[PDB]
């Protein structure tokens, strides 16, 4: 499980 | 201490498009490509005059250069809705001023239907 | 400030074609064999002044061929052309590089693939090695969608100036001309014509 | 005026020629041209030749001797046996003078070059025709007048160059098989006296210019000469030494030792070995002695372009690459050559930093070859670790574009660039770990920022997927993507965010294995991709578009079972919300996303859950359908308008996108519109024919008329790419063919040649291709309906309608192939135009007609021979093998249809083996024009002797018959056959073939 690049890559932009 | 150290701008663009130009050659009734690349609208800042001004690509040798005459119209080409056919009296791209039919071709009908709208601004800008 | 410059392929690779490009910006789409040569003036304008090829645009087919390697004699500069979509178009280049460095000793040389713009394409980039052990500049082009097209005469002007910093600039526009009643039914009648002629390569991006 | 040299009546002046020439190699324009007109008109009389004497000996312009040379070259290749034994002695005295006369006088033998050159080929050409069996001393003479002479010397050497040329390099394509190899015979069987003066010469010579010509006669003599004259006499040491001090020299030998690098060697002497060894130890001291170091930085003095650098940079590196290609394993044993192993690999590691597209390649062709033996070998990679650590970086830093960020010379070079990059991750995957990770912190702390060099790093990241363990490959991505996405909100401003989110999708999409180990990041990369498809800034939508379908292709499965922590597949999540999806993307971009849809469904085995997902993929185009079909049958008139006429194409062109992806699982969707998509192929094509009738052609021209046609070209396309893929034919014959035929094939036959869809053969190829055996009334159709009509567009000129050209043949040879029995169905007048329309296929340059042509005549031959004796065969061969033979030979024998020779030849051996075999029962003669009982070979014999004759008359009969016999003696080796061609188009291009020829292969 990977929640924090998950998240790091959601806010891209 | 002091050491030695070691040893067409007159104009400003209303409109700027890309386009395939195209000039008749009507003893052979067809079309011949006069170059493709940066279409721009130049407005003389101590005359006010705009005029066409395009460069082919890599070469950039001027394949248009005439003022955007008042009287000059432009018309549909019956094979394409992307395109403007008018005549030209003076154009001074390859030498002594000499008259053309060209045609202008865009990548789209909306870059087309722009082309026209500042065209004919740049033509009363031209008339005053 | 003038330089010779010879082209030389077979038939149909599309040397005419190419300097027709370079000297209207026209694609001329029919096959007319040139007989013999075709001589013709091309200027580059560059950041070292203008620079002007001579080019001696010869015929590929051999029935058309005229004085074949006379036309090479006092050349500064050479063009090998080939056709990527047909093999024996490549077969030939050393037929034709045999016959343009006998006359021809010491002079700069591009190898020029052309057609690129082809799906179908014949001869593979991974194939073409032959310009190494020759010392030729290659470059994939094609007259017809200009990829690469001004390459070969940059390429040939850095050598032929000595300056590999040489770059193609852009000739300075002078302002136009300001615009009789006695011709204007007269060009109502081209216009007319112009305008019911149909655009070529209308399906083309521009 | 200039046209008087044309009058060969009157005496030649040669001052008129003369101007003549001055006007057209220093003259301009006008003058230029008709001068030019006028030599080539003097040029080919066929007298000239008897006026070159006199040029050479009375003009003072070199051109004008030059051409004079010319029209004797034309003469003595063409014509030189046809001549009194008067003239070849003489014209044989006055080249021989000439050049004696020439290379007297030290002013012109330094001044007219081009000409003595053009003097010694002509010699050489008259070598070819009378060497050495009418000139037996012109060698030893040849040596003699060397020591009087240092110049005589000098042009000996060009001379022997110019005939090693024409006996070895290109004989294969201008000489008869037995021509070539008795030169070769000769040159071979006295070379030991001719190297004895080169090399004397080599050892002695002062004049660099002899030495320099001396040396370019010996790469020549490389291409052939036994190893014993290289290895045993000592030339090597003066190639490796001596002549690489000078540059004079350096730029010839360097050839020249590359050559020696491919002789062959015995691969057992231990003494050869040593000598192999030795002139590369020689060769590279003397480049680091006087050329540049090891250190030197060959990417500057490439660019600086001094002299002759750049070429002598690019022959060290085709040196360097050749020898060690075939020799690096005689220095990596002995620890005394470790030194000179690596110091040859460094100069490549900096050749390999020149920017030139080109040398980089013949250098990354070499490296492949290293890493490739590396990888492989045992025990030889600890040798190369700092080389091969240098080339990482040098790799890594010249990565170019893939095609997944038009150019084909691009594509060719990042696979060549992946695969030794991969090569040398498995090499040391540590180490180019670190080489990567340290290269991004440059990018993030500014020092190395720029566009091209994150794409650039980016690319070389995503190259080496599937080297490293998942484990390292996992930490890998990780901290590659973090430092990417830190380094994407370091910046600012639209351009500077978009490039980095581009490499960030793309490092991303190359990593499969990852992704599909980790779902949540896998759902969360698509969903940024599809925030990015409502992003407008130039090219986001591309690039999330492109991604999409990429990570689908590798990831699919993922898509369509039901994860751990989620509700339904993911695909029912993607369907639901692929309005809101798509509503800012051009139609291509919503095409690309509706394939990779279908990819995922496809892979859903349920079928009655893929057709559940198919439609409900479709239903956004199967609404807009329903209401337009609803709309356009209740006024026709609608398609003229040209928003709907739009609206139509792009529902069409969806369901062609899906159908792409899913092959036979669309049949579902394909029934649901089949019925009235074909009664609007109709009725659009009411609308076409009804606008050509009212604005004439040029409607074709039109948006409006375009648009419809676009309509028309999208319904084939999609029946095509159904029927191509189709797994259930008994469904495809029984629903889909009769009513496309109906649809299609009149409108075809009746609309006026311009307004002709190709696409309808096109697709009319595919329906044979795949059912053709099954509908043969249906063939018979689509022959009745496209034959005729088709080829009356066609057989005026090879210019116009070039589509319907090349679909043409295409259908053609698959009915030939698939459904014959259509073709035995036609009356015989449309049987005798189809068999016009293969020769005419074979007069065509356009390849994509001329290989069918060709393969249709064979495959034709092979249907008609296996009728067995029937009356239909007989009558074939009675009316068609002499058209077909007469017809293969034209093609064969008029030099502008070289491309099919092979094919032309195989058709031919087939012809004839057919008589020679016996497989043609009836006689080929009228019961007239033979005896009784004349066999067929006889007839045959007879009939190709007079056609040759009369197409060939300067032959000799006996030159016809030599030919003939070779040939058919050989009608069962296609090689051999083959040659016997090729050497009866040598003889045809001259007088005089020896028929002796001809028994070559005997
Ligand atoms: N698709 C494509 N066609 C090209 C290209 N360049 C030339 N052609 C076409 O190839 C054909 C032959 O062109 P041409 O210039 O006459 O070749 P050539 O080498 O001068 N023939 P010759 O030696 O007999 O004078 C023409 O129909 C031309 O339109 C190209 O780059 N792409
Ligand atoms: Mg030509």
Redesign the pocket.
């Given at each position: 499980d990977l929640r924090k690049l998950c998240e790091r890559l959601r806010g891209m932009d | 201490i002091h050491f030695e150290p070691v040893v067409e701008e007159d104009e400003e663009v209303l409109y700027k498009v890309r386009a395939k130009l195209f000039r008749f050659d009507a003893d052979a009734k067809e079309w011949k490509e006069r170059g493709t690349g940066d279409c721009k609208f130049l407005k003389n800042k101590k005359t006010n005059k705009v005029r066409i001004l395009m460069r082919r690509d890599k070469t950039l040798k001027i394949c248009a250069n005439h003022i955007i005459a008042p009287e000059y119209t432009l018309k549909p080409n019956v094979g394409s809705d992307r395109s403007w056919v008018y005549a030209c009296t003076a154009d001074i791209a390859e030498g002594e001023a000499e008259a053309f039919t060209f045609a202008i071709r865009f990548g789209s009908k909306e870059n087309a239907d722009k082309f026209k709208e500042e065209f004919e601004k740049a033509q009363e800008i031209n008339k005053k | 400030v003038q330089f010779k410059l010879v082209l030389v392929?077979?038939?149909?690779?599309?040397?005419?074609?190419?300097?027709?490009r370079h000297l209207t910006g026209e694609?001329?789409?029919?096959?007319?064999?040139?007989?013999g040569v075709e001589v013709h003036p091309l200027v580059f304008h560059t950041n070292r002044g203008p620079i002007k090829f001579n080019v001696w645009?010869?015929?590929?087919?051999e029935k058309?061929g005229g004085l074949r390697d006379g036309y090479y004699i006092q050349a500064q500069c050479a063009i090998i052309?080939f056709?990527v979509?047909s093999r024996v178009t490549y077969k030939n280049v050393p037929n034709w590089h045999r016959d343009l460095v006998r006359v021809c000793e010491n002079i700069p040389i591009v190898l020029c693939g052309?057609?690129?713009?082809?799906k179908d394409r014949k001869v593979k980039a991974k194939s073409i090695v032959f310009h190494r052990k020759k010392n030729l500049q290659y470059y994939d082009?094609?007259?017809?969608?200009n990829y690469n097209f001004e390459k070969p005469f940059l390429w040939l002007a850095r050598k032929l100036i000595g300056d590999p910093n040489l770059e193609f600039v852009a000739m300075p526009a002078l302002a136009p001309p300001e615009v009789d009643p006695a011709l204007a039914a007269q060009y109502e009648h081209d216009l007319e014509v112009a305008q019911t002629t149909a655009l070529p390569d209308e399906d083309d991006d521009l | 005026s200039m046209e008087g040299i044309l009058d060969f009546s009157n005496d030649l002046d040669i001052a008129l020629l003369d101007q003549v020439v001055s006007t057209f190699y220093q003259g301009s324009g006008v003058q230029q041209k008709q001068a030019q007109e006028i030599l080539t008109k003097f040029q080919d009389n066929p007298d000239a030749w008897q006026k070159a004497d006199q040029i050479l000996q009375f003009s003072t312009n070199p051109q004008s001797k030059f051409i004079a040379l010319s029209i004797l070259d034309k003469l003595i290749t063409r014509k030189w046996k046809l001549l009194p034994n008067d003239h070849r002695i003489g014209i044989r005295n006055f080249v021989v003078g000439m050049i004696i006369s020439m290379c007297q006088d030290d002013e012109v033998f330094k001044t007219q070059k081009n000409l003595i050159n053009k003097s010694d080929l002509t010699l050489v050409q008259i070598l070819k025709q009378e060497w050495p069996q009418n000139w037996p001393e012109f060698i030893p003479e040849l040596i003699g007048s060397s020591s009087s002479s240092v110049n005589v010397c000098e042009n000996n050497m060009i001379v022997l160059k110019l005939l090693s040329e024409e006996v070895f390099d290109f004989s294969a394509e201008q000489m008869t098989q037995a021509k070539a190899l008795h030169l070769k015979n000769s040159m071979s069987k006295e070379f030991e006296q001719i190297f004895k003066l080169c090399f004397q010469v080599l050892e002695q010579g002062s004049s660099s210019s002899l030495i320099v010509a001396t040396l370019e006669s010996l790469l020549r003599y490389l291409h052939w000469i036994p190893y014993r004259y290289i290895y045993e006499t000592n030339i090597l040491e003066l190639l490796s030494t001596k002549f690489m001090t000078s540059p004079d020299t350096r730029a010839i030998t360097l050839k020249c030792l590359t050559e020696v690098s491919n002789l062959k060697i015995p691969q057992d002497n231990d003494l050869i070995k040593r000598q192999t060894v030795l002139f590369f130890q020689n060769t590279l001291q003397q480049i680091a002695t006087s050329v540049m170091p090891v250190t030197a930085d060959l990417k500057a003095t490439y660019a600086n372009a001094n002299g002759n650098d750049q070429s002598f940079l690019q022959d060290l590196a085709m040196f360097l690459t050749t020898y060690l290609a075939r020799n690096r394993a005689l220095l990596e044993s002995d620890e005394s050559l470790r030194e000179l192993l690596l110091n040859a690999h460094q100069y490549l590691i900096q050749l390999s930093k020149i920017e030139e597209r080109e040398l980089f390649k013949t250098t990354l062709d070499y490296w492949h070859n290293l890493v490739a033996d590396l990888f492989y070998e045992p025990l030889k990679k600890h040798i190369y670790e700092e080389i091969c650590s240098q080339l990482r970086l040098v790799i890594i830093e010249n990565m170019v574009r893939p095609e997944e960020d038009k150019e084909s010379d691009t594509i060719q070079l990042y696979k060549s660039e992946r695969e030794v990059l991969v090569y040398l991750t498995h090499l040391n995957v540590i180490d180019t770990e670190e080489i990567m990770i340290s290269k991004l912190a440059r990018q993030i702390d500014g020092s190395e920022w720029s566009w091209h060099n994150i794409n650039t790093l980016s690319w070389a990241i995503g190259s080496i997927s599937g080297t490293m363990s998942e484990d390292t490959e996992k930490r890998f991505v990780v901290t590659v993507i973090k430092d990417l996405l830190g380094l994407c909100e370091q910046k600012r401003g639209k351009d500077n965010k978009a490039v980095v989110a581009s490499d960030i999708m793309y490092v991303v999409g190359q990593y499969p294995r990852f992704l599909k180990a980790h779902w949540n990041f896998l759902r969360t990369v698509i969903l940024k991709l599809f925030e990015f498809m409502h992003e407008t800034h130039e090219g986001v939508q591309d690039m999330a578009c492109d991604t999409f379908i990429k990570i689908v292709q590798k990831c699919k499965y993922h898509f369509v079972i039901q994860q751990p922590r989620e509700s339904e597949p993911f695909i029912q999540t993607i369907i639901r919300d692929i309005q809101k999806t798509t509503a800012d993307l051009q139609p291509q971009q919503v095409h690309t996303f509706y394939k990779a849809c279908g990819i995922i469904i496809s892979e859903e085995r349920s079928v009655a859950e893929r057709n559940r997902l198919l439609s409900d993929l479709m239903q956004l185009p199967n609404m807009a359908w329903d209401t337009i079909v609803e709309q356009s049958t209740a006024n026709p008139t609608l398609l003229l308008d040209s928003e709907t006429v739009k609206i139509i194409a792009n529902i069409i062109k969806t369901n062609v996108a899906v159908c792409t992806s899913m092959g036979a699982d669309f049949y579902p969707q394909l029934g649901h519109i089949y019925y009235n998509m074909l009664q609007l192929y109709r009725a659009v094509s009411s609308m076409i024919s009804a606008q050509v009738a009212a604005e004439g052609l040029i409607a074709t021209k039109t948006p409006k008329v375009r648009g419809l046609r676009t309509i028309k070209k999208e319904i084939l396309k999609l029946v095509e790419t159904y029927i191509s893929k189709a797994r259930n034919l008994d469904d495809v014959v029984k629903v889909l063919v009769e009513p496309l035929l109906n649809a299609v094939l009149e409108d075809y036959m009746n609309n006026v040649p311009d307004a002709r869809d190709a696409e309808v053969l096109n697709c009319m190829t595919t329906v044979v291709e795949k059912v053709g055996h099954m509908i043969p009334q249906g063939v018979i159709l689509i022959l009745q309906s496209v034959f005729e009509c088709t080829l009356d567009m066609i057989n005026k000129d090879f210019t116009e309608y070039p589509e319907h050209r090349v679909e043409f043949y295409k259908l053609l040879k698959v009915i030939n192939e698939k459904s014959f029995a259509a073709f035995l169905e036609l009356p015989p007048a449309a049987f005798k135009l189809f068999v016009d329309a293969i020769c005419w296929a074979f007069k065509h340059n356009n390849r994509d007609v001329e290989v069918n042509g060709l393969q249709i005549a064979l495959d034709l031959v092979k249907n008609i021979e296996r009728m067995g004796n029937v009356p239909f065969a007989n009558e074939f061969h009675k009316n068609y093998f002499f058209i077909f033979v007469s017809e293969t030979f034209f093609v064969l024998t008029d030099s502008d249809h070289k491309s099919g020779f092979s094919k032309q030849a195989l058709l031919l051996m087939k012809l004839i083996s057919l008589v020679y075999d016996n497989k043609i029962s009836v006689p080929l003669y009228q019961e007239a024009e033979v005896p009784q009982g004349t066999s067929n070979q006889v007839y045959l014999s007879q009939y190709l002797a007079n056609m040759l004759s009369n197409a060939f008359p300067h032959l000799t009969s006996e030159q016809i018959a030599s030919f003939l016999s070779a040939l058919t003696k050989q009608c069962k080796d296609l090689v051999v056959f083959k040659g016997t061609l090729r050497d009866f188009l040598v003889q045809i291009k001259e007088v005089g073939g020896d028929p002796t020829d001809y028994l070559f292969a005997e």
């Open positions: - | - | 392929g077979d038939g149909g690779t599309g040397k005419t074609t190419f300097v027709k694609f001329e789409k029919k096959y007319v064999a040139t007989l645009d010869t015929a590929g087919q058309f052309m056709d979509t052309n057609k690129v713009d082809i082009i094609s007259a017809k969608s | -």
